[PDB]
Chain A
């Protein structure tokens, strides 16, 4: 599982 927060910031939606 690549990191939750870091991801969401880059992707959004």
Chain B
């Protein structure tokens, strides 16, 4: 009274509408994704504030975990959506802004657009349950840390296994409670790698003024800050395998 898993279910932020004026230049479309992505990330912040145990990490580890994991989150969420909504077929960023095969033909998109689908693809391969989903999503936040760990190391440490626990529970719903974990922690692994791409691009488009690509205040602030930190490659992807 109540389960944390059910608490998870409730805090998960509502799907966002893109407000896209759908009458199609590829600068614009990506500019829009960015505009959307900004609010999406703002929403993930409240969601962080209301994670159980998040407030008693240290402000710096709060910043830090978000800042490093933020793409990992949005890309993951986008996978889930694109799973639920077209069972893998299309990228469904917002109900109003869906990328069918057709919009991938658009100039520079495809590349990224294929590696976003890969993420959805993995939901389709593993047939992930919504509870299973939420669980990892939380983990993903706690999976991208500095090479020289944390400003409140101990605290994190417990939390991490806490939510891994919760992922147990999730598949507990036989001979799976260590067995399916492999298939699913393998995913949590392969994220770091697939995010890697999207994360880069994003970077490229950010510093490369003469592309006319627009990013909103929120994200600017974080990319422009996370830039050098990721230059060094001074970021530890915590895996399982």
Contact = CB atoms under 8 A, between A and B. Distances in A.
Interface string B18-56: 000000000000000000000000100110110000000
Contact of A9 (B49, B224, B225): B49
B155 interface: no
A6 B114 CA distance: 30
B217 A10 contact: no
Q: How large is the interface on B (under 10, 10 to 19, 20 to 34, 35 or more residues)?
A: 10 to 19
B4 interface: no
Nearest to A3: B221
Nearest to B62: A10
Contacts of B67: 3, 6
B222 interface: yes
Contact of B49 (A1, A2, A3, A10): A10
What band does the interface of chain A fall in when counting residues whose beta carbon is under 8 Å from B? 10 to 19
B7 interface: no
B215 to A, nearest CB: 13
A6 B66 contact: yes
Contacts of A10: 45, 48-49, 59, 62-63
A10 to B, nearest CB: 5
Interface in A1-13: 1-7, 9-11
B172 interface: no
Contacts of B66: 6
A4 B49 CA distance: 17
Interface in B81-133: none
Interface in B133-183: none
Contacts of A6: 45, 63, 66-67, 218, 221-222
A-B pairs, top 4 by smallest CB distance, nearest first, are: A3-B221, A3-B222, A3-B225, A9-B45
Interface of B: 42, 45-46, 48-49, 59, 62-63, 66-67, 217-218, 221-222, 224-225
Interface of A: 1-7, 9-11
Given A3-B63, A6-B45, 9 more contacts: A3-B222, A4-B221, A5-B217, A5-B218, A5-B221, A6-B221, A9-B45, A10-B45, A10-B59
